[PDB]
Design an enzyme around this catalytic site. Structure first.
Site, PDB file in Angstrom:
ATOM      1  CG  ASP A 299      -2.090  -1.165   0.901  1.00 26.50           C
ATOM      2  OD1 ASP A 299      -1.991  -1.875  -0.147  1.00 26.50           O
ATOM      3  OD2 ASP A 299      -2.985  -1.358   1.767  1.00 26.50           O
TER       4      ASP A 299
HETATM    5  C1  LIG Z   1       1.243  -6.054  -0.491  1.00 31.20           C
HETATM    6  C2  LIG Z   1       0.272  -5.065  -1.091  1.00 31.20           C
HETATM    7  O1  LIG Z   1       0.588  -3.918  -1.429  1.00 31.20           O
HETATM    8  N1  LIG Z   1      -0.982  -5.511  -1.272  1.00 31.20           N
HETATM    9  C3  LIG Z   1      -1.911  -4.773  -2.134  1.00 31.20           C
HETATM   10  C4  LIG Z   1      -3.362  -4.755  -1.598  1.00 31.20           C
HETATM   11  O2  LIG Z   1      -3.419  -4.185  -0.276  1.00 31.20           O
HETATM   12  C5  LIG Z   1      -4.240  -3.961  -2.565  1.00 31.20           C
HETATM   13  O3  LIG Z   1      -3.826  -2.591  -2.613  1.00 31.20           O
HETATM   14  C6  LIG Z   1      -4.151  -4.537  -3.998  1.00 31.20           C
HETATM   15  C7  LIG Z   1      -4.947  -3.741  -5.047  1.00 31.20           C
HETATM   16  O4  LIG Z   1      -4.989  -4.469  -6.299  1.00 31.20           O
HETATM   17  O5  LIG Z   1      -2.782  -4.575  -4.430  1.00 31.20           O
HETATM   18  C8  LIG Z   1      -1.902  -5.315  -3.577  1.00 31.20           C
HETATM   19  O6  LIG Z   1      -2.272  -6.683  -3.570  1.00 31.20           O
END
Ligand SMILES: CC(=O)N[C@@H]1[C@@H](O)[C@@H](O)[C@@H](CO)O[C@@H]1O
Ligand SMILES: CC(=O)N[C@@H]1[C@@H](O)[C@@H](O)[C@@H](CO)O[C@@H]1O
Ligand SMILES: [Mg+2]
Ligand SMILES: [Mg+2]
Ligand SMILES: [Mg+2]
Lengths: 735, 744
Positions: A299
């Site tokens: 994030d």
């Molecule tokens: C580890 C990480 O950043 N996880 C994020 C999740 O929280 C969400 O933002 C998603 C949106 O497609 O992209 C990633 O999987």
């Protein structure tokens, strides 16, 4: 065996929380005498603030679609291709100062005297231009909906639920609000033991289109980090003004796959200094309140740079991350400069896996396995799950699964002392990024390899849980200091003109001298896909180190030169564990090899030998001479070859999707190329579906089953004796 | 039915000759009897067959710039073997001509030419010693070599295992002494040959690039190549005349040897201009001497044909009576047929009368008829005047089924000629192939070795093979043509095909905004642009656009720069005019319908079919093509990329095809693409065959059409006439049917 586990919480389920914490040995509980985690979202959850200071939302440079001019004027809609609920043109900051209109047909910037922003619509009027060229606008846009809260809203169909407006602490008013608010929150949260920052200040590039679909994403992307003030300050600190093009990058938006440009590195350095100082303040505040500071690896993690020097000075107690596979496990596990690390393991406790009739124990154990092989090479301190604990309480099978997993995780620690397994070779992945992107090569979206990336991501996934020591180095490292004398193998992998192969760095003769001399002296170079490639530099040589690996790619410049393939060697150390159907090999042997023919060369097998999934083809690879050893060269081109090069060796692999077979193939490549065939036997499993982790300081080795199947394997020990194992589903045996 | 047929013959075979000449209606006989009254052909080999001359003047053999292997330096000195990679029976380094003036040592790692002070040629060994070099770089020598064995004679020797016979040494008429020998010798030969009616020059002065390696295998070939055409004197004269010195590099071209696939460089065009002026002057003299002796001069389109340039203006001024060439397929038939500037053309058909095909247990009649079918479909579009065969008549005479097949073929060849009057069928669209070469390489794009398409080329060569017999008018134009004069107003469709950075796509010409403007305006105005493989491609120019005309054809190729941009594919349209004749596979189609399309997923786009529809052989994949927007029509987009698409572009249309191997089905697909892209769907039916295995040729001025079966199987088809009436045919194996049509 008690602890190292994080329980999620929920509504009025205190009874069952007490029971599942005690059965699983949970020492911490997370919020939707235990350790209490509370998530914190520094740049959102305060619409009452940001609606009164709307010019302080974060911003991003956006590129419009390409519009064709059909005369000397053209109109360019700004927003037709973007999600208008997420993004809005910035009409406050002088567009003639901050935007750029580009003739994409010539690459020239259109003079600002030649365009206007319509007063009443989001449209740019361009005049005095050339008919039949494509034009675009690069414009500043406010981000009016937090990209992740938005993704959660869409994903879960939250309908009319109010949208959270994000805010940027680069502005002093917002910065003060954030810190004052956190100060008060700390006071108001005496029960919280761990502040789980999810995350900090700048969201990874995540932009949506007019159809509410993802438009642009880069887990490492810096798009959502600009503002008129930041841009003006950057120019004062760095001593030149960034163009909008330095962010939109022709429509590539500075994808991590692009060969990095100075402007990108400067911007990363700029944000990093700012983010880190403010993260340290949050951590310090957390500490002064008696609480630990934990960062989510994802994030709003842009500018933190967990793998750059100085990350330790933040004083973060922990990093927690999303466990999707071995590679993503290593991204968390290898981070230096925190006290402990945490994996948020799958499945998430939410209806899409916890429906009546489903067996979530299966996902739960697969995730344990993909990560376990990597954990043996680089331990993570803690484990835990997220979501609805009451949903997971319904499935008794899975509850049992967790008891088993938490116990095994803890037994590894009790036996291991948090020590990594012994690594049998030192392997370095060489690319433009190096250590700052450890375990991060080839990622676009986190944990989501695709058609274009999986043939290379498989290299990291294979390495993630392999019995070797993996490091990440840059071309800058090599050019400044040469190749470290403890490295056995260098791997260079990816398509032409990316950060991962390196682009025009391969026309730098110092680089080529350095690698060639090191291999000649006994080094080992493994090239995957289009290694060492530089387009146009030499008409007759595309891979600049083709002489090392024995293979080049035909680029339609050398079709007049007949290509002669030596006979394939089907029985070889590298391919020793590949099963080949007897009828397949028979067919290959019977069909034989092409006879030389004018303009067509000769020696290519008429039928494929097969047996190995190499992923996406690299078309028209061919051996540079007949002393190269071809190991697979099916369909008139080359998939796998090895070449002696003085005292060292080069190996070519066209691509390498992860599987146990392909990880074995790569592991054998690594021992063979480094002239370490004699070292392969010790601490190996005969079966590729099992792996061995050796722990000598503890006088111990373990063997793991990477599958849900019974696995029979013979482990060869150092002294040369062997041990038979018959491992159950996801089994582990210690000797 | 008699004539337009050349029969080969041999000694002690007058009776079988007389019989077969009569059976096949032959009017010419080829030496390799004299009483029969036939036109007598005799082959002539200007640059070989006289070792007694050239052994006395060995510095007048032709020469070639050769590039050595790359040799790795491991210190500041390096030794480079000159001959280790070449066939020493064919090639000898030129030690006579100052190597420091005429050779170049190159550091291939930097591109730099090594100062000639830093290298020396060993007095005793074919080795260059270089000093003052950088360790860990690769070095090569580019050196002049004498060609001491005629490449074609050598090829025949090796192929036929002549083991023992003396190697014929070639000679170069650029040198005045040799030139005089050749002309005096021809003057003499003509006097000694009163019976000869046609001099079959096989060929003239300069052999196409044909170089062998140390294992007696082909090393380098280019049917169009100018490698074997240099000499110290020619290089020095060129410098005087053009005002700049050619480097050895302008010939060896980094190891590409100026392959016709390379985007042409000015140095190549200048050398062709220079050579062609000299070759043409001397060919004219040979033709003039023949004519003065009461004989015709016929040129073989092949072997020593470099510098003749049959498709360049001025060819007519040679006064050549004829061109004869090898019939390998439709494309190679058209190479001969479309040559202007001669009185008549001739095909030498297959099989050649030789033991490799005429051996017990083989059925050469199948190959004979297959060869006729492939050529016939092209001949209808562009007539050739004559046919014939080559080799040992006595061999063919032992195969009566074959002999009867030839009788059939000769009669049909003449019947086509008599019915149509030697006039080309009506073309229903005007199609232009656009590339760097244009008209001078008519029917010659995508060729490496003559009639030998391979894995690297067949996906593009199939475009020409399809067009070669197709019911449309085909021309070949260059970027220079378009930049100078715009697109001719009669053209309906432009095709641009090939891989990136080749003469066939065009390279950086696609970064010239005038070209892009011209093509876009023309398509917007109702033009049609068909792009195959990597059309309009230019690397690095625009980060987000590889095919420069991606907007026109609706497709681009992902180059790993734009992976952050989710690609969204619209649903494939399986029922469409373009694909109307593709055979339907209901197992495949229902599997494809059921499996549906990928749902959007982060970093992965969406809309790609999870299972392939298939049904069409597009040859070599172009990885990661994608639709530029969801208004493009996808016709095939299997396996997460695009094979076939159409896009409306103002009044006109663009079409993308990833590759196109020749077959009846793919030639039909291309044909439908041309009619569709040019908004000419309602022009499609007139003079068409429902069945793709057959083709129609309309001859408005003779009030006729014919329909031909391009296969060895019976074929039923319905022909549609201009007036919307139809006729059904049941055509036999390889058949043809003629019907009346309204006369115009
Ligand atoms: C580890 C990480 O950043 N996880 C994020 C999740 O929280 C969400 O933002 C998603 C949106 O497609 O992209 C990633 O999987
Ligand atoms: C048409 C033509 O030039 N034919 C030539 C043939 O004569 C021979 O030289 C051969 C060697 O590979 O290359 C081509 O097929
Ligand atoms: Mg769009
Ligand atoms: Mg300044
Ligand atoms: Mg017209």
């Amino acid at each position: 065996s008690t602890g190292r586990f994080t329980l999620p919480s929920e509504e009025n389920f205190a009874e069952k929380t007490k029971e599942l914490a005690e059965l699983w040995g949970a020492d911490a509980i997370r919020n939707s005498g235990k350790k209490i985690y509370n998530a914190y979202f520094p740049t959102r959850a305060h619409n009452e603030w940001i609606t009164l200071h709307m010019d302080e939302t974060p911003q991003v440079y956006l590129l419009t679609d390409r519009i064709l001019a059909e005369s000397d004027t053209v109109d360019i809609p700004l927003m037709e291709s973007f999600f208008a609920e997420q993004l809005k043109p910035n009409r406050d900051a002088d567009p003639h100062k901050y935007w750029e209109v580009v003739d994409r047909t010539t690459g020239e910037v259109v003079d600002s005297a030649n365009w206007t922003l319509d007063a009443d619509e989001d449209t740019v009027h361009v005049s005095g231009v050339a008919a039949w060229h494509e034009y675009t606008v690069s414009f500043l846009a406010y981000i009016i909906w937090d990209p992740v809260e938005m993704y959660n809203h869409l994903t879960n169909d939250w309908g009319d639920k109010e949208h959270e407006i994000p805010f940027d602490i680069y502005h002093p008013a917002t910065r003060k609000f954030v810190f004052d608010t956190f100060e008060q929150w700390l006071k108001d949260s005496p029960q919280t033991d761990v502040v789980r920052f999810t995350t900090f200040f700048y969201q990874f590039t995540l932009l949506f289109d007019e159809k509410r679909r993802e438009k642009v994403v880069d887990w490492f992307g810096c798009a959502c980090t600009v503002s008129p003030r930041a841009l003006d300050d950057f120019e004062a600190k760095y001593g030149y003004r960034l163009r909008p093009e330095d962010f939109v990058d022709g429509g590539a938006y500075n994808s991590a796959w692009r060969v990095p440009r100075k402007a990108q590195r400067d911007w990363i350095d700029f944000l990093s200094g700012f983010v880190r100082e403010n993260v340290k303040q949050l951590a310090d505040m957390s500490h002064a309140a008696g609480k630990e500071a934990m960062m989510f690896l994802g994030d709003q993690w842009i500018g933190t740079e967990p793998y750059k020097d100085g990350f330790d000075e933040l004083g973060l107690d922990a990093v927690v991350g999303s466990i999707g596979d071995g590679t993503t496990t290593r991204m968390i596990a290898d981070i230096p400069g925190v006290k402990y690390t945490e994996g948020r393991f799958l499945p998430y406790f939410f209806p899409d896996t916890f429906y009546e009739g489903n067996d979530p124990s299966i996902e739960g154990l697969d995730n344990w396995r993909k990560a376990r092989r990597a954990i043996l090479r680089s331990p993570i301190s803690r484990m835990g799950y997220g979501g609805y604990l009451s949903l997971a309480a319904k499935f008794p099978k899975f509850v049992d699964t967790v008891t088993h997993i938490a116990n095994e995780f803890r037994d590894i620690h009790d036996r291991t002392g948090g020590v990594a397994a012994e690594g049998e070779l030192n392997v370095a992945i060489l690319n433009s990024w190096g250590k700052m992107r450890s375990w991060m090569a080839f990622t676009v979206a986190h944990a989501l390899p695709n058609k274009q990336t999986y043939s290379y991501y498989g290299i990291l996934e294979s390495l993630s849980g392999m019995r070797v020591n993996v490091r990440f180095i840059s071309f800058d490292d090599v050019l400044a200091h040469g190749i470290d004398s403890d490295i056995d193998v260098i791997i260079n992998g990816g398509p032409v003109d990316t950060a991962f192969t390196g682009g025009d760095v391969w026309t730098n003769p110092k680089l080529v001298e350095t690698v060639r001399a090191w291999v000649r002296g006994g080094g080992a170079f493994v090239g995957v896909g289009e290694p060492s490639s530089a387009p146009r530099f030499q008409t007759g040589r595309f891979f600049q180190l083709a002489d090392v690996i024995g293979v080049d790619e035909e680029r339609y410049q050398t079709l007049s030169v007949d290509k002669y393939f030596p006979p394939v060697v089907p029985d070889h150390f590298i391919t020793a564990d590949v099963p080949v159907d007897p009828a397949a090999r028979e067919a290959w042997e019977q069909a034989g090899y092409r006879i030389p023919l004018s303009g067509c060369g000769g020696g290519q097998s008429i039928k494929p030998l097969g047996g190995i999934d190499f992923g996406e083809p690299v078309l028209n690879t061919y051996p540079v001479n007949e002393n190269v050893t071809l190991l697979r060269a099916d369909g008139g081109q080359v998939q796998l070859a090895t070449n002696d090069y003085g005292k060292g060796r080069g190996v070519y692999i066209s691509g390498l999707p992860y599987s146990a077979a392909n990880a074995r193939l790569l592991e054998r490549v690594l021992f063979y190329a480094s002239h370490n065939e004699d070292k392969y036997a010790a601490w190996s499993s005969s079966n590729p579906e099992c792996e061995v982790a050796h722990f000598p300081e503890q006088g111990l080795y373990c063997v793991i089953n990477n599958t849900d199947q019974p696995q029979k394997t013979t482990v060869t020990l150092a002294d040369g004796t062997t041990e038979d194992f018959d491992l159950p589903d996801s089994g582990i045996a210690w000797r």
